[PDB]
């Protein structure tokens, strides 16, 4: 009858009468996640259900991502777990509820997301990815706008549910690798995905234009110059250089996170006051659900 949620440094007793079911979070690839209000605090949280009867694989992956989240309590850029509740037949996982993902913001904006926002997102996501690798040995392997979450507090956090570690975002060196079935590669492939994601969000346009097939996209990644930010949109020199470095085609010359964290783009966005919160709220208030 009773579980526990820890939020804001405080542990709370929670019975079902304490939780208001506010419905689906939206069109996921996951399912069985609800937005719920915790009546004792007014926090709205996300609750994911893992059925004991569910697919072994899907469940093993959930548990692995959960393991990482539980050990990531010291990272501001990873979505936090508030609690778990195990019944005979299910496990419920309470998570910090974010507003939406960058993929959906792009759709709402019907175009470019401002540099200022993308700068703050870059700082957060690089730090999240770096944290994952350095603390937990996790190489994300799926950095894309759908895994970048924002909220109306102005927080920016990474996602993976997959955090335990998509041809469009594939680095060159990963396209026809020496050993694809024994895929022991490094974080530079994720750096490339980040650069793609930034160009896509900065332009409003996924950079591999009018490709009809996944293979055709891969041909573009290999044959074409990196899809650098355009020169005609008022992008800063630091943002353009940051994206160019991320999109270094030769992976041996592409920077790692520790080097990216020194980039002027990051240094400037660490210090720049940007009201991501108000901006997100305006967007969500003026646009419709994709
Ligand atoms: C572009 C983003 C998007 O479309 N979606 C689909 C709808 C849900 C949204 N989203 N997911 C979470 C979330 C992920 C995972 C869990 O629980 C969990 C799974 C495995 C291992 C540990 C925990 C719960 C929620 C979101 C959260 N927290 N907030 C907002 N949107 C979220 C992704
Ligand atoms: C109100 C919605 C409701 O009932 N629902 C909709 C969702 C699927 C079903 N569900 N949900 C729970 C449950 C369990 C825990 C929890 O919060 C936590 C509290 C502490 C730690 C972690 C999570 C919230 C809801 C649940 C349950 N207990 N038993 C059966 N079906 C359940 C039916």
Rounded radius of gyration (Å): 20 Å
* Structural class by SSE content: alpha+beta
CATH topology of the largest domain: Transferase(Phosphotransferase), domain 1
Number of strands: 10
CATH architectural type of the largest domain = Orthogonal Bundle
SS element count, helices: 9
Question: How many domains make up the 3D coordinates?
Answer: 2
Morphology: globular
Could you state the order of secondary-structure elements as H and E?
EEEEEHEEEHHEEHHHHHH
Largest sheet: 5 strands, antiparallel
What level of helicity do the residues show?
25-40%
Instruction: For the largest sheet, list the strands in their spatial order.
Output: 3-4-5-7-6
> Approximately how much beta-strand content do the residues carry?
15-25%
User: Which molecules other than protein and nucleic acid are bound?
Assistant: ligand 8E8, the ligand C=CC(=O)N1CCC[C@@H](n2nc(-c3ccc(Oc4ccccc4)cc3)c3c(N)ncnc32)C1
What do we call the CATH homologous superfamily of the largest domain?
Transferase(Phosphotransferase) domain 1
Distance between the termini: 38 Å
CATH class of the largest domain: Mainly Alpha
Structure description:
Helix content is about 35%, strand content about 20%. The protein is an alpha+beta fold and about 290 residues long. It folds into two domains: about 1-95, Phosphorylase Kinase, domain 1 (2-Layer Sandwich); about 100-285, Orthogonal Bundle (Transferase(Phosphotransferase), domain 1), CATH 1.10.510.10. The strands form three sheets. It has a five-stranded antiparallel sheet with strand order 3-4-5-7-6, covered by helices on one side. A hairpin with a 4-residue loop joins strand 4 (about 35-40) and strand 5. Helix 3 crosses helix 8 and helix 4 (about 190-205) packs across helix 6 (about 235-245). The longest helix is centred in the middle third of the chain and has 22 residues, at about 115-135. The chain starts with a strand and ends with a helix. The relative contact order is 0.12. Bound molecules: the ligand *CCC(=O)N1CCC[C@@H](n2nc(-c3ccc(Oc4ccccc4)cc3)c3c(N)ncnc32)C1 and the ligand C=CC(=O)N1CCC[C@@H](n2nc(-c3ccc(Oc4ccccc4)cc3)c3c(N)ncnc32)C1. It is classed as transferase. Keywords: kinase, kinase inhibitor, MKK7, MEK7, MAP2K7, MAP2K, MEK, JNK signaling, Structural Genomics, Structural Genomics Consortium, SGC, transferase. It forms a monomeric assembly.
């Amino acid at each position: 009858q009773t579980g526990y949620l820890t939020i804001g440094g405080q542990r709370y007793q929670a019975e079902i009468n304490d939780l208001e079911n506010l419905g689906e979070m939206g069109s996921g690839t996951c399912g069985q996640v609800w937005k719920m209000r915790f009546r004792k605090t007014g926090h709205v949280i996300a609750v994911k259900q893992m059925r004991r009867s569910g697919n072994k694989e899907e469940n093993k992956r959930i548990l692995m991502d959960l393991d990482v989240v539980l050990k990531s309590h010291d990272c501001p850029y990873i979505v936090q777990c508030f609690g778990t509740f195990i019944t005979n037949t299910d496990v419920f996982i309470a998570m910090e509820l974010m507003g939406t993902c960058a993929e959906k913001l792009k759709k709402r904006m019907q175009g470019p997301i401002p540099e200022r926002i993308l700068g703050k997102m870059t700082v957060a996501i690089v730090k999240a990815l770096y944290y994952l690798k350095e603390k937990h040995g996790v190489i994300h392997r799926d950095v894309k706008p759908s895994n970048i979450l924002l909220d109306e507090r102005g927080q920016i956090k990474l996602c993976d549910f997959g955090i335990s570690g998509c041809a469009a975002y594939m680095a060159p060196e990963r396209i026809d690798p020496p050993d694809p079935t024994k895929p022991d590669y490094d974080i530079r492939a994720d750096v490339w995905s980040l650069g793609i994601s930034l160009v896509e969000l900065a332009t409003g346009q996924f950079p591999y234009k009018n490709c009809k097939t996944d293979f055709e996209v891969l041909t573009k990644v290999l044959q074409e110059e990196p899809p650098l930010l355009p020169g005609h949109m008022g992008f800063s020199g630091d943002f353009q250089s940051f994206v160019k470095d991320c999109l270094t085609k030769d992976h041996r010359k592409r920077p790692k996170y520790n080097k990216l964290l020194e980039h002027s783009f990051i240094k400037r966005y660490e210090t720049l006051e940007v009201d991501v919160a108000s901006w997100f709220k305006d967007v969500m208030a003026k646009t419709e659900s994709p």
